[PDB]
Amino acid sequence: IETPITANFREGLNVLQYFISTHGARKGLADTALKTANSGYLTRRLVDVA
Amino acid sequence: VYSYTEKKRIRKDFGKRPQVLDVPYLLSIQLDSFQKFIEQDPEGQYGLEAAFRSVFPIQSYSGNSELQYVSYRLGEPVFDVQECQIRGVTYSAPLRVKLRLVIYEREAPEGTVKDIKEQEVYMGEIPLMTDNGTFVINGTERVIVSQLHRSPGVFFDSDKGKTHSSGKVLYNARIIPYRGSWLDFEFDPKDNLFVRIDRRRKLPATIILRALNYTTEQILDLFFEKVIFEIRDNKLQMELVPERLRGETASFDIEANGKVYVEKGRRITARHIRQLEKDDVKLIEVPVEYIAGKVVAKDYIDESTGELICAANMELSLDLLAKLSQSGHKRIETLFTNDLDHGPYISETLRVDPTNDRLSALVEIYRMMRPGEPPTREAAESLFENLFFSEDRYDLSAVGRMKFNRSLLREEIEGSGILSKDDIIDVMKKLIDIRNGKGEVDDIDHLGNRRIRSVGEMAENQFRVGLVRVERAVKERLSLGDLDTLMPQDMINAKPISAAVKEFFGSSQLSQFMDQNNPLSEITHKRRISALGPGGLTRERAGFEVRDVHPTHYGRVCPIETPEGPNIGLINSLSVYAQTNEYGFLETPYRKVTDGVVTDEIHYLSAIEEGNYVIAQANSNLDEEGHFVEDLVTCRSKGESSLFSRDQVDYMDVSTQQVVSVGASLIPFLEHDDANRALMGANMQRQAVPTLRADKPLVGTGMERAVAVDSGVTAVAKRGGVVQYVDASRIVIKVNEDEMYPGEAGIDIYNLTKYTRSNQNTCINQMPCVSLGEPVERGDVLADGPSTDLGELALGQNMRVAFMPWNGYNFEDSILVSERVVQEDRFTTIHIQELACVSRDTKLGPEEITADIPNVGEAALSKLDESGIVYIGAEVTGGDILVGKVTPKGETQLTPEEKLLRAIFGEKASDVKDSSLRVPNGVSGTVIDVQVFTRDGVEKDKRALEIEEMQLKQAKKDLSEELQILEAGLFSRIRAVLVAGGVEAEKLDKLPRDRWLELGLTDEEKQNQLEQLAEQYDELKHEFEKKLEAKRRKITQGDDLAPGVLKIVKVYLAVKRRIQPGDKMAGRHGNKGVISKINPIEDMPYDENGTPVDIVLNPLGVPSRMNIGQILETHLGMAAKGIGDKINAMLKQQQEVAKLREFIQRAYDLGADVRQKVDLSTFSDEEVMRLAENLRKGMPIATPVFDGAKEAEIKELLKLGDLPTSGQIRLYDGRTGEQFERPVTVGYMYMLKLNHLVDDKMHARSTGSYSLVTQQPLGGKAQFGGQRFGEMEVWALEAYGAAYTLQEMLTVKSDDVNGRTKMYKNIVDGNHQMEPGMPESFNVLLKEIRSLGINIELEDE
Amino acid sequence: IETINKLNRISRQMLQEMGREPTPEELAERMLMPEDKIRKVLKIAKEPISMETPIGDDEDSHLGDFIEDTTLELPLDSA
RNA sequence: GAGUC
DSSP states (O other), rough: SSSSOOOOOOTTTOHHHHHHHHHHHHHHHHHHHHHHHHHEEEEEEHHHHH | OOOOOHHSSSSSSSSSSSSOSOOOOHHHHHHHHHHHOOOOOOSSSHHHHHHHHHSSSSSSSSSEEEEEEEEEEEOOSSSOOHHHHHTTTEEEEEEEEEEEEOOOOSSTTOOOOOOEEEEEEEEEEEEHHHBOOOOEEEEEEEEEEEEEOOOSSEEEEEEOOSSSSTOOOOOEEEEEEEEEOOEEEEOOOTTOOEETTTEEEEEEEEHHHHHOOOOOHHHHHSSOOOOOEEEEEEEEEOOOOOOGTTTOOSOOOOOOOOOOOOSSSBBOOHHHHHHHHHHHHHHHHHOOSSSTTTTOOOBBTTTTSSOBSTTTTOOOOOHHHHHHHTTOOOOEOOOOSTTSSOOSEEEEEEEEOOOOSHHHHHHHHHHSSTTTTOOHHHHHHHHHHHHHHTTTBBOOOOHHHHHHHHHTTOOOSSSSSSSSSHHHHHHHHHHHHHHHHOOOOTTTOTTEEEEEOOOOHHHHHHHHHHHHHHHHHHHHHHSSSOOTEEEEEEHOOHHHHHHHHHHIIIIOOOOOEEOOHHHHHHHHHHTTEOOOTTSSSOTTTOOHHHHHHOOOTTTTTTTTTTSTTTTTTTTEEEBTOEOOOOSOOOEEEEEEEHHHHEEEEEEEEEEHHHTTSSEEOOOOOOOOSSBSOOOOOEEEEETTTEEEEEEGEEESSSGGGSSSSSHHHTTGGGGGHHHHHOOOOHHHHEEEEEEEOOOOSSOOOOOOHHHHHHHHOSEEOOOOOEEEEEEESSEEEEEETOOOOOOOSEEEEOOOOOOOTTSSBBBOOOOEEEEETTOOOOEEEEETTTOSSSSSSSEEEEEEEEEEEOOOTSTSSSEEEEHHHHHHTOOOOOEEEEEEEEEEEETEOOOOOOOTTTOOOOHHHBBBBSSBBOOOOOEOOOTOOOEEEEEOOOOOOOOHHHHHHHHHHOOOOOOEEOOOOOTTTOOOOEEEEEEEESSSOOOOHHHHHHHHHHHHHHHHHHHHHHHHHHHHHHHHHHHHHHHOOOOOOOOHSSSSSTTTSSOOOOOHHHHHHHHHHHHHHHOOOOOOOOHHHHHHHHHHHHOOOTTTTEEEEEEEEEEEOOOOOEEEEEOOSOOEEEEEEOTTTTOBBBBBBSOOOSEEGGGGGGGTTTHHHHHHHHHHHHHHHHHHHHHHHHHHHHEEEHHHHHHHHHHTTTTTTOSSOOOOOOOHHHHHHHHHHTTTTTTEEEESSSSSSOHHHHHHHHHHOOOOOOOOOOOBOOOOOOOSSOEEEEEEEEEEBSOHHHHHHHHOSSOOOTTTTOOBBBHHHHHTOOOOOOHHHHHHHHHHTOOOHHHHIIIEEEEEEEHHHHHHHHHHHTTOOOOOOOOOHHHHHHHHHHTOOOOOOOOOO | HHHHHHHHHHHHHHHHHHHHOOOHHHHHHHSSSSSHHHHHHHHHHHOOOTTOOOOOOSSTTTTTGGGGGGSSSHHHHHH
16 A cells, blocks of 8 residues: 555554554454464375375 | 533543544444334334235135234233343233234125124234343343345456456356345356356356347347448448447448548548548448348348248348348348447357247246256246246345445336346346446445344344245135134234244344443444354355455444454444444444535435545544644545545544444554554453452543443433432432423332343442432433443453563563452452252152252251252352252162172162252352242242242332332422412321322312322322232242253352462453462562552563553553542642642643643532542543543653653562662553453363263363363374373273273272273274275284 | 144144143143143153254254263272 | 464
């Protein structure tokens, strides 16, 4: 996204800016749930060979 | 300028902007929807009304008898709220409906002159909603969650890449009904149009229109644009419109009017096109080549013989042109397919489409649905029509219709349920459009494309289902029997109605146990919104798109309240001010901006409407209730953000907090907390537990008052006036004469609920807030729920926390806590657990409840009553017996050894088993109350009688004093009217009471109101005598339980659970921790002043976790206590009231751009000193979410507290007395203890109950189970060389019975030897292989 | 079997006439026999339940994962 | 339904 975050945590961001960050936040956390499944299954494949 | 409760606790608002309109009563959604279900409104087609008219009026087969619907009535509930809770009943009202049987005559034309029968029939009990917005489901509190789904109508979807190596563009419009099967239209790779019908498979779209009786000719007419091709002499001339040449390579010399126009080869550019457009062209001079390649429109029959020279949709060719001109059909009508704009789509379609007419179209329809079923005419027709055009089967609802009509850009808002045929054609038009590039694609996740289901619409649908089944039955029995003598009441069944209801309420996954950990959990949980459920999204069906953050969630759903893990993205909280429109779309309120000036006018917009207009954020600065601060201002529009000038400003946010959900709104310095932890914070709040003591949160958002109020666990004043009686059980209030109804007496009653069991084992305790004889107004907080202080949400308590390392006790977010926490009993949790005892009867004989048990000491005997019952108030621990039960044993076949031994000690012991209910080990506490449910059949126990006698006494006393206090208030009110026109105080009072109804005075309007309260008095009598007689019978009535069950005992245990090491706690900012050690007071570091700290957090937990708000809370928190301590000292020092006056006012008004302009000086001395003592314990300040206190205003307060500006002080280590080489951050922070109790989470097993088939230990602490050793864990042992541990886990610890038993006793014989066996799971396995018919056998060596 | 037929068909009558559930006493009278045989038939009425019934709201447990076996004594018992 | 990474 073209418009960035100028302020910082200490001074406090605004309405607009905070909403931005949820995208990255949520994306990251959602990633955890569904991605560790892939890794896990992978691991089990490898283990079953070796 | 504030009410009495606020006068008592004013929190200092730092909020720099004014919330204009009020925070709407949050739990309104539920009530409004449910209330719509029952809404008596003839025209408004919803709920009852909607379903009724859809089916009714119900006409019989023969056309002579009919059933008509008049109207419905809701009775008064058979069972009250509390009572249903007690007996495990569902809370419900009777529904009774007026129905009329009318019979026409066969012979007389339609003479309704024969027979007219009518009555009100009972159609079952309908579950009612509480005052809270909850529901009573077999004795437990449940909530129905709102449901998001993809709204009925049209979805225009594009597969960008999506599928293919090629990377081809695939367009699909989806047809989503309320009720019925589904329709998909998509583009084949070579651009040919296919349908998925009920997503079964893919076949040609064209066939459908054949079924609708369109010939190929009508098809291509309506779709493609015909072109008139005149043949005169030997010259071929088209009627050409200029903008069809649009970028057309010239294939000929194009002679129009005069001279050469287009080069033989050179392309038609726009200037050429506009020139010939200007010329006004009718007929050009095409050669021989153009028509060869195109196609003919209609079916051109040969006039001469009568036979078809050309059919519809044949490729154009040389000889055919000669023959058609020879027939004298000199007006041919060719088609237009020059790619680009109007392409060869439907044309190519028709060629691959093998089907011909109406007939073969319906054949293929029928065939795909049930392949192999023979083509009967009736079956195919009926199938087709029933699929999309049947009214009771296929209903779009108002919703489907609106969104559908807005997808194709129509005008009518409402429609009929069934799909009109024109609609279908027009959408396929829009698909073909998008394929060419006239319009573009609608997004799946748009908030206008997603709709929400409340209560009423859910109810609606499930009610309709009961109706459907009942319809089969109804129409069936209407034709067999005799029409005259049989009545409507004998016709009507109830079973399937009540079945449908209990399925919805009971079985549904959207209906769940209320989260009652805290008021916050409840209130939040009630407004949570799920994407799952019937007609909604699945786990695997869910990719990234839907779960991630859609821009439209702005001000509608709070973006930051969702469970972590797999359900993330699925479940979300409604944002604060957001509400649903009529259609079930979310709307958000905005302020109108008229030409630069910010009005006061509030407009709610849907997502759809939102997409249009240009709106400024709440943070933009406001010029003196007129215009804007800045000439270039900051806003958003059409889903993107940036700069605009004043004049372009259309609308604006009311307040910042409108973007946030409720839970998140409570966290103060949200502005400085990363969302990762923010999210976690909200969830944490939901898992918090009420301690006994409520300490007001010093660092709040102001929102704590609204949260409390709305949760509805408090008592609020209906009328206001003066408090007559205060009890820790009853609050009785005398109303303002202003507000008082001339109907009933002015006496409002609040019986408080004290100390009952919540679902999570939590305690439910109400405390009265006001004192006796005190003044209150409408909407004053009268009694608090558990986690609530005077008006405010009090999730927990605030403590002195210091950031710093301790001797590795605070390592990775571990928590060091003081003994002082225990000493002061803060965070001591209240638990109320329910234990049960169940007495049945078997073939083995009657189980019963007795004090008599084999081989127990008088220790247990002494704590039991006559019947085997615990005494009230008993203190009991693990292993203790609560309720005695005996069960008949079978034959005792003892080993020979046991036979002899019996003989030897000579205690034969009767054929009985000890079944008694015992306290589970680890838990221990206080039996507070016991309830018993006797059977109807079997005679009552003495314990039974005495407790039901108690119920009598209690019932009596309660209702007696109800009548007595109500009576006194009513008589005192009559005294106010007789004292007007009739001064007499000495001989009225001293004379009797009810001889004030022989009272015959002035006959004006004085005598009329006496009778008003006099007839009300007669009803006080007839109501009470009933209200008594009803509640006597229910107490005494035999309690009806499950078949086989004689009697039940419910035992309510109180757990006084103190905070300990291993317990879980956190703050608002996500940061959390386990208690690692309780340090004695001595060990904790302390101030120069001598006060030591309460809790120590490790600093290292903050930086990388990114949540700085907790720090600001700490600093502000010490400052608040600095204010409190200033106040405390001046309070203790008495001094002068005016002096206190000065300090306190200047405190409020300190904040630089403080909005909340605190009016003090006028305050009466009383109000002053009282408030003083409240803020004695620290001042309550308000930083609103984002609209919060800057670093500047905060440091300013620190100066006023006479503290360090950085909030750091030099501290001494309580162990050594050595000072810390750096001054450290301290301050007061608001803390919470979570539902997670190491108490319950402790478990360990040696040997116990095993699994039936596999013979392994069972699961969980629940069964005293062994923990499961998974693949990964096994793998651990594998990596080491460790064979024996492995084999242990494999055999002696699991499925080998001989092995485990043998090894246990060898261990007890000091052997520790292994001696391995054979896994019983393995044998299990073997035999299952044999059973599936495969021979597998163990080879001998 | 036929006695059972009576049961459920008269259940509907009595539920609607009396208002609520049919307690054994009143039912006993209305069907022309002794109370004893009522309660007997009541409990016998129930059919077998699925062993692998998903009681786990999440497919955590097929009810087999509840089952405890009293036949096999504990190693404690063996001791 | 919620904890852990």
